[PDB]
Design an enzyme around this catalytic site. Structure first.
Site, PDB file in Angstrom:
ATOM      1  N   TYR A 112      86.583  24.530  10.591  1.00  0.00           N
ATOM      2  CA  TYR A 112      88.082  24.830  10.982  1.00  0.00           C
ATOM      3  C   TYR A 112      88.262  23.612  11.474  1.00  0.00           C
ATOM      4  CZ  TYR A 112      91.797  26.773  13.302  1.00  0.00           C
ATOM      5  OH  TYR A 112      93.209  27.490  13.829  1.00  0.00           O
ATOM      6  N   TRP A 114      92.985  21.258  12.436  1.00  0.00           N
ATOM      7  CA  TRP A 114      93.509  20.132  12.039  1.00  0.00           C
ATOM      8  C   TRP A 114      94.184  19.268  11.058  1.00  0.00           C
ATOM      9  CZ3 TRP A 114      99.262  20.911  12.909  1.00  0.00           C
ATOM     10  CH2 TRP A 114      99.669  22.420  13.272  1.00  0.00           C
TER      11      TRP A 114
END
Ligand SMILES: NC1=NC(=O)C2=N[C@H]3C(S)=C(SO)[C@@H](COP(=O)(O)OP(=O)(O)OC[C@H]4O[C@@H](n5cnc6c(=O)[nH]c(N)nc65)[C@H](O)[C@@H]4O)O[C@H]3NC2=N1
Ligand SMILES: NC1=NC(=O)C2=N[C@H]3C(S)=C(S)[C@@H](COP(=O)(O)OP(=O)(O)OC[C@H]4O[C@@H](n5cnc6c(=O)[nH]c(N)nc65)[C@H](O)[C@@H]4O)O[C@H]3NC2=N1
Ligand SMILES: [Mo+6]
Ligand SMILES: [O]
Length: 779
Positions: A112, A114
């Site tokens: 996970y 950004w």
């Protein structure tokens, strides 16, 4: 040496770089950007800061002992510098060893994070592309932003709702009379985008203020949103928003003001919710006075707010902080239920919106085509042969530590029961779980279950400091790529051009995974015979042929590259009204729910029989809350999103000097709460509870309501001693204090803002911060 200017983009916007003798010396915002972000200067600095990872490193203990290594020392900084060939061989050997010994269930590939924008250099997809060729991996589902709301919404309104286009800003300017920002700070959070942002909300917000529309903000913090509009500000005790909504609903029933026709023709199950609201089921009528006792918000204010919403064209723009908490599912479910009672759903300027604070939601969409990018290949494979036993191949993202701790155990999720796989290796790229995940001390111990942990990054984050194998990645600015401008608007396509040559021994994720795939005997399968520019040209060429078909003209690839950008035209995009067609004719255009209407009571959720997720919006006591019966700690920590960071990004740059307090992450405290502890502005303080303890630097303000402190998420965790359980964090990672629990059995979302603690002035031994300088052996 290179001298000139180069245009590129990022998560913070479009910019022009100035290059001098081969070094980027300034980033200037795009001329058409309506509201550039002040963090651009930090992005530039992120390329050259002292925490930049130079060379491939291997953990000394892991080098010498492999799987027999002592895993408690992960994070101590004892690294060995190795050659790329050595590191690649090791990484390939370990991936192959885990796949052969444990199968695909032994490799966790959720990773996970950004990362950075770009259709080619998508590190997380590239990692799954390689893992696919290696035999399989375990993945993650959902996200840390709308973990509870994205699962509850489809049962209520039919679709995800949170990541869908909103009623256009211009429609709001001409029609909205009352604008409510509920747990939303659009000014702060609209600075970034998942793909390149166009900052479209700023102009939109500016038009509301020019129109003189009444604006109401409901948040425990006096934000820039409040200040920008000089808004009426309601401050509830964090986590009591649902109580206020019931209190408002109760008023609308009691004074007989709600919209019975709206309820009757577009909703289902109100009659099963009414009894609860009136106290027939529990002997507790959910009055404004009852809401007052829990939230702290005056009863008459709640009644006045309810009546104003019913008599004016009102837009309820809700943020996501209030569902990133225990029982998060109820917050937006109750908001829609309240929205239903007001009866403005589908009218120009009325209803509700869940993405006005995120990535330009509401900015009119163009008619331009969609841009595609590299895939992981799973849709044209014929992956692992999987089955219960070994276990589930997908877990909800926030249950990664539960999984590590309980291999084989069962877990609930949206009506189903699955088992946790027995993971032995975790490979992380473009994410920072040692900052983003909850309850740091629990997770520090659970990581000992992993034999091997591999990380790629360009900055020495806490995650990278804890790896067995660290590989230095390049930034977006040391390579070429292509990406969309505007997550909802689709304003255009940008050429993300290379600005400078790769630093030190940094390599792109693509090249790293290419080399690892080569050692597994799958090189051509990974690369597909294409190089960087061959991939980028094929994404653009596909968009162009799609454009052509729709009547949008687009230049040839090299003409586009010479310009650096293509902009698409807006046709009917500025008149979009969410839910208009459902309002106009519900039988012809129904929702994707079982009944086809807004489901206030869910039969489907009823059959799941989950204690922590009833079949209708319900008030429930959370694990811990400010002034809750038997609460052990006194202060609620509003652990929200950083103003001058993108999560953890840019912490180890020059921007930190502008907000740190005595070198530590800042903590906003109310003067009364500071007075009581004999705390003065600028003091170093110890924040602690039963899960951990951290040091921060105080800023005394009445911007935060009494009883609430603000410590933004994203601080780089800097442990005094990794081998000491519950060691003190010297910098200020708010996730050392949060609990790691599911929102409820339905979504299993993170409860990252369900945190209470105590604060005291720090008088212990002086401390030395070590998180903003590279590990000694990495210099
Ligand atoms: N207590 C909490 N409160 C919260 O509110 C809170 N928010 C959530 C949410 S909402 C999110 S996002 O849905 C996560 C974000 O955590 P994430 O690991 O994505 O954070 P970053 O600081 O953006 O880490 C990115 C990481 O990636 C590196 N990098 C960038 N480009 C690339 C690349 O191309 N190659 C590689 N290998 N690396 C890349 C960056 O440098 C950076 O380190 O947080 C939750 N937690 C919450 N807690
Ligand atoms: N500059 C900036 N940096 C970022 O890191 C950032 N990250 C992006 C990401 S990934 C996402 S998912 C989004 C998140 O968008 P999201 O709405 O989840 O943001 P938060 O900063 O967690 O909370 C926003 C507001 O909610 C308030 N709030 C907290 N709890 C309560 C409460 O219980 N009740 C009420 N009524 N309000 C409360 C906070 O005080 C804050 O002002 O922002 C995005 N935008 C970003 N902007
Ligand atoms: Mo998010
Ligand atoms: O996110």
């Amino acid at each position: 040496l290179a001298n000139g200017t180069v245009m590129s983009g990022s998560h913070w916007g479009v910019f022009t770089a100035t290059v001098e003798n081969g070094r980027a010396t300034a980033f200037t915002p795009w001329e058409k950007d309506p509201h550039p972000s002040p963090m651009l200067a930090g992005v530039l600095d992120s390329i050259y800061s002292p925490t930049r990872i130079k060379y491939p490193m291997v953990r000394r203990e892991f080098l010498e002992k492999g799987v027999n290594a002592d895993r408690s020392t992960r994070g101590n900084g004892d690294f060995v510098r190795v050659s790329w060939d050595q590191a690649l061989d090791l990484v390939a050997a370990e991936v192959k060893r885990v796949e052969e010994t444990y199968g695909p269930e032994g490799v966790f590939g959720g990773s996970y994070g950004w990362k950075s924008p770009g259709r080619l250099h998508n590190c997380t997809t590239l990692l799954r592309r390689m893992l696919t060729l290696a035999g399989g991996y375990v993945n993650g589902a959902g996200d840390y932003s709308t973990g509870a709301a994205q699962v509850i919404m489809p049962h209520v309104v039919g679709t995800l709702e949170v990541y869908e286009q909103q009623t256009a800003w211009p429609v709001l300017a001409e029609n909205t009379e009352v604008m409510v920002f509920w747990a939303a700070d659009p000014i702060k959070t609209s600075q970034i985008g998942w793909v390149i942002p166009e900052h479209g909300a700023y102009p939109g917000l500016e038009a509301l203020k020019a129109k003189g529309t009444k604006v109401i903000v409901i948040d425990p913090v006096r934000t820039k949103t409040v200040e920008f509009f000089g808004a009426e500000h309601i401050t509830p005790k964090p986590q009591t928003d649902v109580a206020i909504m019931l209190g408002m609903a109760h008023t609308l029933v009691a004074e007989d003001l709600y919209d019975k026709d709206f309820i009757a023709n577009y909703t289902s199950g109100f009659d099963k919710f009414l009894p609860y609201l009136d106290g027939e089921t529990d002997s507790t009528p959910k009055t404004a006075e009852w809401a007052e006792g829990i939230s702290g918000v005056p009863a008459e204010t709640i009644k006045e707010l309810a009546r104003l919403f019913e008599s004016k064209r009102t837009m309820l723009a809700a943020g996501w902080s209030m569902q990133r908490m225990h029982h998060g599912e109820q917050a937006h479910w109750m908001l829609v239920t309240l929205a239903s009672m007001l009866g403005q759903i589908g009218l120009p300027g009325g209803g509700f919106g869940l993405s006005y604070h995120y990535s330009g939601g509401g900015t009119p969409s163009t008619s331009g085509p969609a841009l595609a990018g590299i895939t992981d290949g799973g849709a044209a494979t014929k992956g692992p042969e999987w089955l219960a036993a070994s276990g589930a191949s997908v877990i909800p993202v926030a249950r990664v530590v539960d999984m590590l701790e309980n291999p084989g155990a069962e877990f609930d999720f949206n009506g189903t029961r699955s088992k946790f796989p027995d993971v032995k290796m975790a490979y992380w790229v473009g994410g920072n779980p040692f900052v983003h995940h909850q309850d740091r001390n629990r997770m520090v111990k659970a990581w000992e279950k992993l034999e091997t942990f591999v990380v790629h990054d360009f900055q020495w984050t806490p995650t990278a400091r804890h790896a067995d194998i660290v590989l230095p990645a390049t930034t977006s600015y040391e390579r070429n790529d292509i990406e969309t401008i505007g997550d909802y608007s689709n304003t255009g396509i940008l050429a993300m051009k290379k600005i400078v040559e790769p630093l030190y021994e940094a390599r792109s994720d693509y090249d790293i995974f290419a080399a690892v795939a080569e050692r597994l005997g799958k090189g051509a399968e990974f690369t597909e015979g294409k190089d960087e520019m061959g991939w980028i040209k094929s994404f653009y060429d596909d968009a162009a042929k799609q454009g052509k078909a729709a009547g949008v003209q687009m230049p040839a690839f090299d003409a586009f590259w010479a310009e650096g950008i293509v902009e698409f035209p807006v046709t009917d995009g500025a008149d979009f009204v969410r839910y208009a067609s459902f309002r106009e004719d519900p039988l012809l255009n129904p929702l994707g729910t079982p009944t086809g209407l807004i489901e206030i009571y869910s039969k489907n959720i009823e059959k799941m029989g989950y204690d922590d997720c009833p079949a209708h919006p319900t008030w429930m006591e959370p694990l811990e809350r400010l002034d809750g019966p038997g609460a052990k700690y006194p202060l609620h920590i509003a652990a929200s999103h950083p103003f001058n960071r993108l999560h953890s990004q840019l912490n180890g740059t020059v921007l930190r000097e502008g907000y740190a307090v005595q070198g530590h992450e800042p903590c906003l405290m109310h003067p009364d709460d500071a007075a009581a502890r004999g705390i003065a502005d600028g003091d170093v303080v110890r924040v602690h509870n039963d899960r951990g303890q951290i040091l921060t630097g105080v800023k005394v303000t009445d911007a935060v309501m009494k009883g609430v402190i603000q410590i933004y998420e994203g601080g780089w965790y800097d442990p005094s001693d990794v081998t000491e359980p519950g060691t003190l964090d010297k910098y200020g990672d708010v996730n050392v204090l949060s609990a790691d629990i599911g929102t409820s059995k339905l979504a299993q979302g993170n409860c990252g803002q369900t945190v209470l603690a105590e604060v005291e002035k720090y008088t212990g031994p002086a401390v030395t911060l070590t998180g903003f300088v590279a590990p000694k052996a990495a210099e």
